[PDB]
Automatic annotation (TrEMBL), chain A:
<feature type="binding site">
    <location>
        <position position="245"/>
    </location>
    <ligand>
        <name>NADP(+) 3</name>
    </ligand>
</feature>
<feature type="binding site">
    <location>
        <position position="206"/>
    </location>
    <ligand>
        <name>NADP(+) 2</name>
    </ligand>
</feature>
<dbReference type="GO" id="GO:0042802">
    <property type="term" value="F:identical protein binding"/>
</dbReference>
<keyword id="KW-0285">Flavoprotein</keyword>
<feature type="binding site">
    <location>
        <position position="229"/>
    </location>
    <ligand>
        <name>NADP(+) 1</name>
    </ligand>
</feature>
<dbReference type="GO" id="GO:0034899">
    <property type="term" value="F:trimethylamine monooxygenase activity"/>
</dbReference>
<keyword id="KW-0560">Oxidoreductase</keyword>
<feature type="binding site">
    <location>
        <position position="290"/>
    </location>
    <ligand>
        <name>NADP(+) 1</name>
    </ligand>
</feature>
<feature type="binding site">
    <location>
        <position position="245"/>
    </location>
    <ligand>
        <name>NADP(+) 2</name>
    </ligand>
</feature>
<feature type="binding site">
    <location>
        <position position="207"/>
    </location>
    <ligand>
        <name>NADP(+) 3</name>
    </ligand>
</feature>
<feature type="binding site">
    <location>
        <position position="205"/>
    </location>
    <ligand>
        <name>NADP(+) 3</name>
    </ligand>
</feature>
<feature type="binding site">
    <location>
        <position position="411"/>
    </location>
    <ligand>
        <name>NADP(+) 1</name>
    </ligand>
</feature>
<feature type="binding site">
    <location>
        <position position="125"/>
    </location>
    <ligand>
        <name>FAD</name>
    </ligand>
</feature>
<feature type="binding site">
    <location>
        <position position="290"/>
    </location>
    <ligand>
        <name>NADP(+) 3</name>
    </ligand>
</feature>
<feature type="binding site">
    <location>
        <position position="228"/>
    </location>
    <ligand>
        <name>NADP(+) 2</name>
    </ligand>
</feature>
<feature type="binding site">
    <location>
        <position position="204"/>
    </location>
    <ligand>
        <name>NADP(+) 1</name>
    </ligand>
</feature>
<dbReference type="InterPro" id="IPR050346">
    <property type="entry name" value="FMO-like"/>
</dbReference>
Length: 446, 445
């Protein structure tokens, strides 16, 4: 029988399992599946941990997610086309659910799919090697439950290990002398730790504004955002200052290209992440900056130097969960022989055409629309439930407008589901006052 | 032949120095390549502000923190081939700060001229033994070029340490605790805990000292809980000893006796695991931290593959002089100077050492054991013999001074066992010596 290795059981790994299960449910014969996951449970980023740095087994802590994290875009923009919010929750819910609520949702799909049986948890992928003599992959893993290292043979490999977990952490002059905490966004966990404190937020990557917003919400004395890029455009609260790039620090103070100086209690480097695959040699290893179109990926999924190796979710993310679905459905159909691949030259030429287009994008609206077009291209090739992508783009547009109107209240807005048409109700508590982040409090009418 | 040395900490440096000394005496030495993931040598001694993952996404290696001073008497770590009198040109106190000790460590290794063998910013990804060619393939990631390459080697000496990958147990309610939870490995600056109540869990390597640093730099209260036997130390007024932790909530810690207390931060001083992600089970050492790990002939030679070597993998009562003794021995085995017995005979010898290890109860017995182990290694090579029995006695003096007063043991002086020099009293008592710089230590203050 054909054997598939799925690396990671986050949203992308779960999507790959769901894809194969969906084909089987429709009556098709699917290959044997093995999914490796270093954590004790599925959900990837969405599986919260108090741990930072290295985990219970000495593996790098994967999740970058923090307490009180809520959906950053409308839930309506990440809804599964094959498993709606209506089906899972049985009632309408607001448009920006807390982490635990969205975790419950993504788990619900694969729980009902019955795919947990394919996953080996607490198992870290150590190496993937392609054997030219057999046309198969040797995947070496460390099972931390047995404390054993073993390897198995696989015909295809799908890498779903994410790219928002290995931090890019630049040093600034004086960091060794600084008296307060220095952490990366990746280590940020509890905004309460910074109550009545002055927090310096360095950079403009994914979590810069939200981490600042959490610190604000949970009672930080002052926030300072310093970054090299163009103004974020947002009207910050009274106790929140903006600065140009940080230059140096001392024992207590930060110094900027401004010439200005200020006392800071903690520094949070919101400087992003690197694509990091220590289990892969250079023949298979994706090397790219975070962007909408990394090269060497045919249809953004197929590794062009070895078309039996696949990557899911390695692009920067406006769309997320239903993008991973589109990708997983495509990867499944290629593996199952339903979508034969063109030549290596033909693959590269297609990938370059998408790259050329990527380089022309100049607005946020053009960016998510480009990703929408990419997803539309993927779903047209498979049996993934068709959904309204132009209407999803307009929801993103509305979300963008809401952030412009007020950066602290954008999460209080409601949107129409594009799968069911369900109009999300107003939440029972404004975001700024909703200090309890639990699933229980969110789903309760109070 | 070609040798791969994994890591350029004290152990990797010891292995390099072993070969260079053999060459200095007129012998023909194998080709040496040392792989080190950090930007410079020193291992633990290369302090960093960084925690968790480094600039390249590799686990941060050093566990060392600001204000760290020598653990025991410097006289007990003093190099058998390079004295403190040689390096500093003057007598200094018995417990030098990290920077001062590092100056001393780097002084010997710079003199040896072994830096040329080391490839820095380079992380070892995999080591695999090839049965067909009887050689090792070492796969490596050069972070300067961001390229992964492999090279062939005849022998491999693993010096990657065992105090860097933390054992981090979970307690009930950790998910909801409102304060910082960190491992000793993540501890950097005691000033972060000024005016705060700190809970220290466990009794591993840095438990006592981390609490002492927090105390010295202005922590409000300190609470210690552990599973091992109490030492009966005379802790300060704001230092509290409790039964072991069972539970936490949003801001309180709950203990076995039923008592509770508000805590601002929790530091898990719970030790480390032997973790070698670059090795498969054929070469991979599996052991708890102890004086005699199994499968290591003379504590060094991997018994399932005698061409693989481990340095410094034992628990460290002795440190630098042990790595030297081990490195000199590994060198002599690699060079064919010392023939190895059979696998069956190697394992029998290891069992005898293990059975002896299991009889040990007191600190004195454990020092003597490790001292005996080191003497055995030195007897087989040309490494200069040193006064082990008197070193044991100096260790026990230190232990006696810790029992007299845990906060002032660093103010005591001890006699050098290499030169006979009695260490002078430091110009500033430990509790008042807030500056940890080399400049402030060596000058008149
Ligand atoms: C702080 C933060 C907030 C975010 N907020 C949102 C949001 O609000 N809305 C949204 O749509 N998206 C958000 N995202 C984007 C996020 O990337 C996606 O939502 C989603 O989690 C991506 O899923 P994934 O499976 O591709 O990767 P991940 O979720 O990161 O999952 C990867 C999985 O692979 C496993 N793995 C990695 N290496 C190994 C190994 N060597 N061996 C075994 N297993 C391994 C990991 O344990 C993990 O389970 C956020 C991301 C971050 C970092």
């Amino acid at each position: 029988a054909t054997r598939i290795a799925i690396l990671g059981a986050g949203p992308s790994g779960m999507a790959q399992l769901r894809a194969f299960q969906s084909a089987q449910e429709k009556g098709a014969e699917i290959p044997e599946l093995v999914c490796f996951e270093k954590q004790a449970d599925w959900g990837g980023q969405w599986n919260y941990t108090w741990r930072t740095g290295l985990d219970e087994n000495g593996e790098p802590v994967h999740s970058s997610m923090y307490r009180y994290l809520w959906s950053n875009g409308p839930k309506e923009c990440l809804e599964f086309a094959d498993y709606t919010f209506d089906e899972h929750f049985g009632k309408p819910i607001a448009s920006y659910p807390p982490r635990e609520v969205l975790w419950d949702y993504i788990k619900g799909r694969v729980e009902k799919a019955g795919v947990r049986k394919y996953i080996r948890f607490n198992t870290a992928v150590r190496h993937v090697e392609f054997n030219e003599d057999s046309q198969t992959f040797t995947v070496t893993v460390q099972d931390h439950t047995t404390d054993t290292i073993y390897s198995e043979e696989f015909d295809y490999v799908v890498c779903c290990t994410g790219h928002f977990s290995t931090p890019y952490v630049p040093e600034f002059e004086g960091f060794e002398k600084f008296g307060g905490r220095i952490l990366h966004a990746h280590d940020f966990r509890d905004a309460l730790e910074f109550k009545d404190k002055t927090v310096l937020l360095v950079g403009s990557s994914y979590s810069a504004e939200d981490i600042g917003s959490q610190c604000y919400k949970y009672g930080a004395k002052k926030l300072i955002s310093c970054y090299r890029t163009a103004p974020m455009g947002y009207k910050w609260p009274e106790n929140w200052d903006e600065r140009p790039n940080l230059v140096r620090v001392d024992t207590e103070n930060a110094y900027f290209a401004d010439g200005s100086s200020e006392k800071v209690d903690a520094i949070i480097l919101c400087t992003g992440y690197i694509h990091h695959f220590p289990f892969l040699n250079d023949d298979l290893r994706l090397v790219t900056n975070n962007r909408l179109w990394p090269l060497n990926l045919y249809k953004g999924v197929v590794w062009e130097d070895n078309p039996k190796f696949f990557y899911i979710g390695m692009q920067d993310q406006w769309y997320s969960f239903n993008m991973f679905d589109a990708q997983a459905w495509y990867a499944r159909d290629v593996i199952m022989g339903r979508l034969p691949l063109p030549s290596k030259e033909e693959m590269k030429a297609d990938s370059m055409a998408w790259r050329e287009k990527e380089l022309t994008l100049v607005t946020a609206e053009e960016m998510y629309t480009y990703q929408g077009d990419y997803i539309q291209n993927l779903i047209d090739m498979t049996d993934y439930p068709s959904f309204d992508i132009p209407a999803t783009n307009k929801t993103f547009l509305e979300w963008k407008h809401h952030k412009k109107e007020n950066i602290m209240t954008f999460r209080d807005h409601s949107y129409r589901s594009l799968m069911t048409g369900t109009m999300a109700p107003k939440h029972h508590t404004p975001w700024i006052d909703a200090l309890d982040d639990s699933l229980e409090a969110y789903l309760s009418d109070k």
